Amino acid sequence: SMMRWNRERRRLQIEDFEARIALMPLLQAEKDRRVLQMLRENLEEEAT
Amino acid sequence: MNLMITLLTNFTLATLLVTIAFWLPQLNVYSEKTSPDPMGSARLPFSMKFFLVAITFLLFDLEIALLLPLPWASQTTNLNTMLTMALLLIFLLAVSLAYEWTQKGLEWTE
Amino acid sequence: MSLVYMNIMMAFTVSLTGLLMYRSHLMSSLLCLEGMMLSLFILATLMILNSHFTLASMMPIILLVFAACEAALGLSLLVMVSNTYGTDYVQNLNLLQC
Amino acid sequence: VAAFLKNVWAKEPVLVASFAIAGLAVILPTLSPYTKYSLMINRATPYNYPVPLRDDGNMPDVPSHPQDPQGPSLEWLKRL
Amino acid sequence: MNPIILIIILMTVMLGTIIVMISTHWLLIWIGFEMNMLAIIPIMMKKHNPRATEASTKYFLTQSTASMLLMMAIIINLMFSGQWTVMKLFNPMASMLMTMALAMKLGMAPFHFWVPEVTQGIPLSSGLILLTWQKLAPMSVLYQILPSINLDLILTLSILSITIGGWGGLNQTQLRKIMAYSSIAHMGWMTAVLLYNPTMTLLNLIIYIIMTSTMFTLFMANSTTTTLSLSHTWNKAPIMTILVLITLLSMGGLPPLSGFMPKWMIIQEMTKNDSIILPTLMAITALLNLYFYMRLTYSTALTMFPSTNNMKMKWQFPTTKRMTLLPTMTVLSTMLLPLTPILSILE
Amino acid sequence: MFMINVLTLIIPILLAVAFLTLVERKVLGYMQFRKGPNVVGPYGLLQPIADAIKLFIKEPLRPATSSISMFILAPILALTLALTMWIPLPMPYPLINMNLGVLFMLAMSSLAVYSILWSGWASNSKYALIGALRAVAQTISYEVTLAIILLSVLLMNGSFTLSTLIITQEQVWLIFPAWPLAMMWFISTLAETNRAPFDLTEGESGFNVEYAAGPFALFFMAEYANIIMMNIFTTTLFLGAFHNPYMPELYTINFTIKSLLLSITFLWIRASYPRFRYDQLMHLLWKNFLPLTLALCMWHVSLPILLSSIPPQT
Amino acid sequence: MMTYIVFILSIIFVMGFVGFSSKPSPIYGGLGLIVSGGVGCGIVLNFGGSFLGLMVFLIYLGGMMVVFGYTTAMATEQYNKVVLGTFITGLLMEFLMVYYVLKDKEVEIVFKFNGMGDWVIYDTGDSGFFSEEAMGIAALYSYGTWLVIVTGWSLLIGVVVIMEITRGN
Amino acid sequence: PGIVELPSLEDLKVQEVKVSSSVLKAAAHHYGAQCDKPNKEFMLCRWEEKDPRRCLEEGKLVNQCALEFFRQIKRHCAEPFTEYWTCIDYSGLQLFRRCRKEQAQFDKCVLDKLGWVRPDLGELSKVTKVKTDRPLPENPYHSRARPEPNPEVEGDLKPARHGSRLFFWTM
Numbered sequence A: 001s002m003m004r005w006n007r008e009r010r011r012l013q014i015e016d017f018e019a020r021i022a023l024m025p026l027l028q029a030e031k032d033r034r035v036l037q038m039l040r041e042n043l044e045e046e047a048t
Numbered sequence B: 001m002n003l004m005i006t007l008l009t010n011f012t013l014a015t016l017l018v019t020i021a022f023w024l025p026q027l028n029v030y031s032e033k034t035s036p037d038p039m040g041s042a043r044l045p046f047s048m049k050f051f052l053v054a055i056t057f058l059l060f061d062l063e064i065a066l067l068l069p070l071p072w073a074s075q076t077t078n079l080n081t082m083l084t085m086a087l088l089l090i091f092l093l094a095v096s097l098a099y100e101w102t103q104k105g106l107e108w109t110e
Numbered sequence C: 001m002s003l004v005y006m007n008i009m010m011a012f013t014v015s016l017t018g019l020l021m022y023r024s025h026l027m028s029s030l031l032c033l034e035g036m037m038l039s040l041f042i043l044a045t046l047m048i049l050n051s052h053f054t055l056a057s058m059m060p061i062i063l064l065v066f067a068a069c070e071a072a073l074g075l076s077l078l079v080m081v082s083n084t085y086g087t088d089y090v091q092n093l094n095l096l097q098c
Numbered sequence D: 001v002a003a004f005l006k007n008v009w010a011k012e013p014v015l016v017a018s019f020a021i022a023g024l025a026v027i028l029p030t031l032s033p034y035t036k037y038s039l040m041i042n043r044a045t046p047y048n049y050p051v052p053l054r055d056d057g058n059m060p061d062v063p064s065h066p067q068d069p070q071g072p073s074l075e076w077l078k079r080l
Numbered sequence E: 001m002n003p004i005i006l007i008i009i010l011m012t013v014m015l016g017t018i019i020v021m022i023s024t025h026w027l028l029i030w031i032g033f034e035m036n037m038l039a040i041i042p043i044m045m046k047k048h049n050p051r052a053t054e055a056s057t058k059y060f061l062t063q064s065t066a067s068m069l070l071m072m073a074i075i076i077n078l079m080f081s082g083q084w085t086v087m088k089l090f091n092p093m094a095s096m097l098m099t100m101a102l103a104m105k106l107g108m109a110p111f112h113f114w115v116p117e118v119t120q121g122i123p124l125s126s127g128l129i130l131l132t133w134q135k136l137a138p139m140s141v142l143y144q145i146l147p148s149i150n151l152d153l154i155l156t157l158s159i160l161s162i163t164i165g166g167w168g169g170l171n172q173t174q175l176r177k178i179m180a181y182s183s184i185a186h187m188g189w190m191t192a193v194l195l196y197n198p199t200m201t202l203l204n205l206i207i208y209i210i211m212t213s214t215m216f217t218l219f220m221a222n223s224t225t226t227t228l229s230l231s232h233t234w235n236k237a238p239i240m241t242i243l244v245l246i247t248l249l250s251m252g253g254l255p256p257l258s259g260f261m262p263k264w265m266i267i268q269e270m271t272k273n274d275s276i277i278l279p280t281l282m283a284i285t286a287l288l289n290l291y292f293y294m295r296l297t298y299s300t301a302l303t304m305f306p307s308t309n310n311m312k313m314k315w316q317f318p319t320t321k322r323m324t325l326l327p328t329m330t331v332l333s334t335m336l337l338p339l340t341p342i343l344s345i346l347e
Numbered sequence F: 001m002f003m004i005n006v007l008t009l010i011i012p013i014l015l016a017v018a019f020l021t022l023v024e025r026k027v028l029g030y031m032q033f034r035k036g037p038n039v040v041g042p043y044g045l046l047q048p049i050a051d052a053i054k055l056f057i058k059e060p061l062r063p064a065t066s067s068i069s070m071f072i073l074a075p076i077l078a079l080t081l082a083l084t085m086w087i088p089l090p091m092p093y094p095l096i097n098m099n100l101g102v103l104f105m106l107a108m109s110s111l112a113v114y115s116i117l118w119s120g121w122a123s124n125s126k127y128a129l130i131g132a133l134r135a136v137a138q139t140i141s142y143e144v145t146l147a148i149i150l151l152s153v154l155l156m157n158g159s160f161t162l163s164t165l166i167i168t169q170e171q172v173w174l175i176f177p178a179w180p181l182a183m184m185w186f187i188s189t190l191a192e193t194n195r196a197p198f199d200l201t202e203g204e205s206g207f208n209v210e211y212a213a214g215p216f217a218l219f220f221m222a223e224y225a226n227i228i229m230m231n232i233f234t235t236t237l238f239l240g241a242f243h244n245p246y247m248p249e250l251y252t253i254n255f256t257i258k259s260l261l262l263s264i265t266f267l268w269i270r271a272s273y274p275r276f277r278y279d280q281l282m283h284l285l286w287k288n289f290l291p292l293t294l295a296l297c298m299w300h301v302s303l304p305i306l307l308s309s310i311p312p313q314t
Numbered sequence G: 001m002m003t004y005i006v007f008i009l010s011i012i013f014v015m016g017f018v019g020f021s022s023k024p025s026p027i028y029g030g031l032g033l034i035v036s037g038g039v040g041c042g043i044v045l046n047f048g049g050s051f052l053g054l055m056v057f058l059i060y061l062g063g064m065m066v067v068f069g070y071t072t073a074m075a076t077e078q079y080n081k082v083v084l085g086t087f088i089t090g091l092l093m094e095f096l097m098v099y100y101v102l103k104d105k106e107v108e109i110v111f112k113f114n115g116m117g118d119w120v121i122y123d124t125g126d127s128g129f130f131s132e133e134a135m136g137i138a139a140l141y142s143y144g145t146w147l148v149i150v151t152g153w154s155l156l157i158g159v160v161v162i163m164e165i166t167r168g169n
Numbered sequence H: 001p002g003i004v005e006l007p008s009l010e011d012l013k014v015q016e017v018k019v020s021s022s023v024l025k026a027a028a029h030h031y032g033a034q035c036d037k038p039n040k041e042f043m044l045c046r047w048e049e050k051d052p053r054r055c056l057e058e059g060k061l062v063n064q065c066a067l068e069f070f071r072q073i074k075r076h077c078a079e080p081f082t083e084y085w086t087c088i089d090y091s092g093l094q095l096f097r098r099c100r101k102e103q104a105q106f107d108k109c110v111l112d113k114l115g116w117v118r119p120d121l122g123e124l125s126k127v128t129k130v131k132t133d134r135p136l137p138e139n140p141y142h143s144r145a146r147p148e149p150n151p152e153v154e155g156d157l158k159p160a161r162h163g164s165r166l167f168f169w170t171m
């Protein structure tokens, strides 16, 4: 029973990880624009 | 943060109950008591065997500390090496127990 | 550098000077020695977690285990001293002056 | 080899069970047909991002899309 | 001790030193020192008397303190370099702490104060291990970190070791304390040439290990731990007086013996680097070592102290002790100076 | 709102410990062919209240302590640890959902011997100190098989997360692949809480006999909180219930019934056996439970590999 | 103030060491080292070292200081100015360190130390579906073969060593 | 040293994908199936340039292609998708295994009305190849020239001239 159920749990883990993989480019683009937004705000306030 | 709040609540409730248990019956005025043990005044004789079982605990606890990342280590892709080193650590804990046996270390607290 | 490293190094030096200035007990010396080890554990841990150096995350556990085995050995030596004199006083360990 | 074994099973069944279970744990993964699938499942688990390859022009085994035929498959895991 | 357990524990001492010698990661250096200390503690408590427990306690405390300072030097190296390669250190504070820790492990002055105690408290075989084999691992670490060692610190430790090991042995009658102060002086000579030519450091270490192994093997073969029992050797075994004579004249560095070989080579490398005062004062200070060596040779070989009557019983029994490599070590510690250019094999 | 959740954890702990004393006296009554308390309340339901009010106005025993500070700290530490063992317990949702809740509980239960040790040294009785050293040596001995059995079970879980242990047991109870681990685990939890047949603090002095009726009652209620907690943890660990995420009270009723039956099984074991001699439970640990525990730890390492049943990390 | 919290724990950490380094008695010193281990564990936990902090509890505190207090309670039979003076000396030196590095945001005892809160040195990303520290400790069985061999051999030899030296024969 | 070169706040303006993580996770397999090409162009550019400032426009393409993904869900299959991500959204771990019938209805509705096939187990974790027009960076680490190595050994090994030359030894 643990054999069948842990193999199902590994398949469900792979399904969750591929949902994560399919979402990582959007999150990476948003993260890049996020950190460049914050660095530009820090640069402008350092300038003033 | 919620953990620190919960620890502070548990510690505060414990300290409050200990303060109540040490100071609620102090309010009574019962009586002063003069009150003038199996050993009378003999100094505590040292047991080598209690120290040996505590040190055996400490060494097997270090071997347990080595064994603790196994539910994570089973996820590796070098599984033959992982299984070999896991069986080798549990086998060395077993060899430690066997040597503790055969030199009469587990005796009179067996 | 970072501010927490100041306190962990100062803790190592405080446990050093406690370990380098005995009062009477050998157990207090072993406690200062294990305080030195604990501060080494904390300092190694804060560096390795800060640097995201993944393979050295097993390093402080190793630094624990050996040194705790070391502590076990020290306790055993203390007990043998305590089984000769009744106390673990460091002034009893002076026979090797002559 | 048989009288000693019945002797130690009569005297010390805890230790006979201990050495027997330990011997099975040692020898049985080398005799199991499913030890290969443990390795294959641990390498099929995508913790990292599948960083794509620059198409030089000559890579017939690398797909252009996840739903393409070429590439590593997991039919064996869904079926077993 | 169980002889199997003795074999496994001595292999673990050797395993710790070899792990120090072959590893490229500082954690495995620290692990080799921990394994070495942990395994050598039962060798010191082989006879189970309070002097062995006192000596093992003092040895444990000094080596444990040095191990903690070693790990702090390693951790500061990881701070200022982000890596673990057993090479030069990337901070003068980590370099100072590692040089102090290795000076504590070697027992170089002013961290010498455990060496004549512990060697006195333990048997002759464990004292032989402590004064020969326990030098190899810290001298290997000093060999590999010499682009970071402060010159002033290493030469201060060297001259303080040579002077204190010279004056310490002049007041002794116990043979193990004589060999311990001889150890302190010779480790001063080894570390004084480390930043100039470490091949001469290896040469001095090898010739010292040969001569110390010869003297401890003679002391084990004659069962003598004091000067005045060593002086009974001529009436028991007259060849051993000749052997302790030539080996003690070698350890003082008198030509044409081989113990003249290292220190001369050390001077040969310290005058190339325009240091003249320092090896001259070192060589003049080594006359103290030679003085108490001459004291032992006057007690043992060149005169005949009065013996006892029961010595006549021991005349009827030959030595059954395995005097392992004693003719080989005696020949190597005396007649090796015509082969002085063999030292290039240590480059 | 979180403070309300902490109070609704820890005040029902104290109430359940209060009425566990009544349940123990009643069940030990009927197993001994007598009744338990049925005079003080209706069916004896006011016996814990009456006993709490009696103990909290009893005269302080007033010992001469070797240390006042550790004599104060040992009940504080006992109650604090006995209340913090509950916060990662998934029933069905923990108060504190932490990734390493199993190792957290193993650590906070390993810290519980300091209350025994500090109370033994803080008393001036040398025989109380000897009893404290025996109790500490017993507890740290059985912690070894706690840690190794617990590791061998969590090799089927995938993580140290306690809430994952419900997901692990959705198809079958984990007592089916691990009943030898379950039975050595259960006797090891019986020996952790100094519970009969391992209660040598009542076998012929306890470590906490110099405390007054109030502080000894606090030690006693920390001990019964540990008992209920370890039964809940054993229930979560081997008898994991069905969990509908839209109806969490089904899991709460189910683990509550199983944990009650396991606590009554503690009560029913103390109504059945004589005590071990001290060396005999040392023999039980070091020469019986620990070799089987190491052998089954090798088996539960190698078994998910040889069957391709390695649980997921997440 | 809460942005300095790890720093605050570290102050208590140093205070705890001035607890046992002054050496009041080995049992109060044991208690001070226990409190120091708990707050240093909190320092470890607030960088993301969950497993290492629980090793501080389970193995350092619950494993080793148990044996220290156990061995200590079998000695120093149950019932100073130098301790009190050493404690106030260490405390005043530590609060002068705190005062300097807070008034200046920089200090130099041996190394230069910033006086900002130690949150500033962190990383601004995610580690995905794993703790990096958990996977680095899991690598002990896959990448750390020599380290496992020498550690387990040292523990076996340590068992042999304790049984040889505690026998007296 | 030099001045860091940051893009302006106008260069960072884009129409964001303002949906929650259960909306994204419920649509994740069809998003990886449909929006493959600008995503993999962006991530190839992101692992090759090692600089987010050099990867902005491709990132905008990601943020342009996700929205056209969701609009085409909103134009056709808004209600089975809404029920499905609501059922995903209830779970504290957002399990896929709790929500298989709402998933089946959403997959049925998308497969009928848009023809999109949900990827099988293994497909989204494949390493794909990406055809680009931007050049490969010749120095992504911005590294300077390495130092020249030491001169090697060459030639036959002759004996030592007159031996060791150690003070008087002729060999």
Ligand SMILES: CCCCCCCCCCCCCCCCCC(=O)OC[C@H](COP(=O)([O-])OC[C@H](O)COP(=O)([O-])OC[C@H](COC(=O)CCCCCCCCCCCCCCCCC)OC(=O)CCCCCCCCCCCCCCCCC)OC(=O)CCCCCCCCCCCCCCCCC
Residues within 6 Å of the ligand: E256, E337, E338, E339, H168, H169, H170, H171
């Ligand atoms: C066709 C195929 C076959 C062809 C076969 C051809 C040969 C046929 C004959 C077979 C026999 C050949 C024997 C070796 C060749 C001759 C070597 C030689 O004399 O070198 C001259 C060597 C340098 O003189 P040279 O005029 O420049 O060279 C003439 C040749 O060209 C020398 O040639 P080289 O310049 O190329 O020599 C290289 C270099 C040349 O030397 C140098 O570059 C100068 C440095 C030499 C070492 C200086 C060390 C200073 C500090 C230590 C002082 C030692 C204490 C004195 C002795 C104490 C008591 C033993 O030698 C060394 O560095 C080796 C060290 C010295 C060993 C010489 C051979 C000894 C073998 C027998 C040993 C028996 C014990 C002897 C005494 C032990 C001490 C040596 O003379 C010395 O250094 C004077 C010291 C005495 C040397 C040993 C004499 C060997 C014969 C002894 C027989 C009587 C033994 C009595 C019982 C035992 C003693 C109580």
Ligand SMILES: CCCCCCCCCCCCCCCCCC(=O)OC[C@H](COP(=O)([O-])OCC[N+](C)(C)C)OC(=O)CCCCCCCCCCCCCCCCC
Residues within 6 Å of the ligand: D011, D012, D014, D016, D017, D020, D021, F180, F182, F183, F184, F186, F187, F197, F234, F238, F269, F273, F284, F287, F288, F289, F292
């Ligand atoms: C979690 C829910 C509950 C779990 C179950 C527990 C419920 C029952 C509890 C009953 C009350 C117990 C009170 C305390 C009892 C203490 C005494 C006691 O039992 O001591 C333990 C006893 C001790 O025995 P002993 O001490 O009497 O035996 C004598 C031993 N010598 C000779 C050394 C003196 O037994 C054990 O240690 C066994 C522990 C469990 C073993 C489980 C083995 C499973 C099977 C393995 C495989 C076997 C076949 C071989 C391989 C085949 C491979 C294909």
Ligand SMILES: CCCCCCCCCCCCCCCCCC(=O)OC[C@H](COP(=O)(O)OCCN)OC(=O)CCCCCCCCCCCCCCCCC
Residues within 6 Å of the ligand: B091, B094, B095, B097, B098, B101, D008, D012, D015, D016, D017, D018, D019, D020, D021, D022, D023, D024, D026, F290, F291, F292, F294, F295
């Ligand atoms: C190879 C696989 C890995 C093996 C190593 C790992 C094992 C896991 C379990 C760990 C056990 C650790 C402790 C072992 C100690 C063994 C020595 C021992 O106990 O000897 C003493 C004992 C007699 O006991 P006694 O001294 O009298 O004590 C009082 C109780 N009567 O003497 C005995 O009882 C004799 C014990 C030896 C005989 C046991 C035979 C069991 C055979 C099972 C089938 C074969 C299994 C394959 C492995 C090979 C086993 C030889």
Ligand SMILES: CCCCCCCCCCCCCCCCCC(=O)OC[C@H](COP(=O)(O)OCCN)OC(=O)CCCCCCCCCCCCCCCCC
Residues within 6 Å of the ligand: E010, E123, E125, E126, E128, E129, E132, E133, E136, E202, E206, E209, E210, E213, E217, E220, E322, E323, E324, E325, E329
């Ligand atoms: C760059 C260098 C790298 C490294 C190169 C190699 C370095 C080698 C360093 C050698 C260190 C030797 C340490 C001592 C030996 C270790 C084993 C031991 O303990 O032997 C003593 C042993 C004990 O027997 P026991 O019965 O206890 O004796 C007391 C009386 N009952 O037995 C006895 O007591 C028997 C009596 C005689 C023992 C003589 C042992 C001599 C060993 C050293 C030989 C010389 C060094 C090798 C050659 C030069 C290498 C540099």
Ligand SMILES: CCCCCCCCCCCCCCCCCC(=O)OC[C@H](COP(=O)(O)OCCN)OC(=O)CCCCCCCCCCCCCCCCC
Residues within 6 Å of the ligand: F018, F039, F040, F046, F048, F049, F050, F052, F053
């Ligand atoms: C402003 C006015 C109030 C002032 C402060 C007082 C606060 C409230 C205190 C409780 C109520 C006051 C009265 C107390 C009981 C008095 C009556 C009594 O004793 O009745 C006896 C009756 C049983 O009769 P019995 O004599 O036992 O006969 C044996 C059977 N053949 O006994 C019974 O039937 C049962 C009696 C139960 C007593 C009350 C219940 C216990 C107390 C609960 C509150 C306090 C504790 C809270 C929880 C503590 C922690 C567990």
Ligand SMILES: CCCCCCCCCCCCCCCCCC(=O)OC[C@H](COP(=O)(O)OCCN)OC(=O)CCCCCCCCCCCCCCCCC
Residues within 6 Å of the ligand: B001, B003, B004, B007, B011, F073, F076, F077, F080, F081, F084, F097, F098, F099, F100, F101, F104, G034, G035, G037, G038, G039, G041, G042, G043, G045, G046, G050, G053, G054
């Ligand atoms: C004698 C003194 C008094 C004695 C009585 C009171 C003390 C003893 C009883 C209480 C013990 C306190 C234990 C505190 C730490 C416990 C370990 C821990 O934090 O584990 C939980 C969790 C780790 O799991 P994980 O999910 O990976 O982390 C969150 C990531 N999402 O990690 C987290 O959730 C991290 C949360 C933030 C960090 C919390 C730091 C706590 C404060 C420092 C330690 C306090 C205790 C110091 C004294 C110890 C005992 C002397």
Ligand SMILES: CCCCCCCCCCC1=C(C)C(=O)C(OC)=C(OC)C1=O
Residues within 6 Å of the ligand: B017, F014, F017, F018, F019, F021, F022, F048, F049, F051, F052, F055, F216, F217, F220, F221
């Ligand atoms: C905060 C206080 C809550 C109430 C106190 C705990 C609940 C009542 C337990 C009473 C009790 C019983 C029945 C009891 O039988 C007993 O003796 C073994 C005790 O220890 C002294 C008790 O404390």
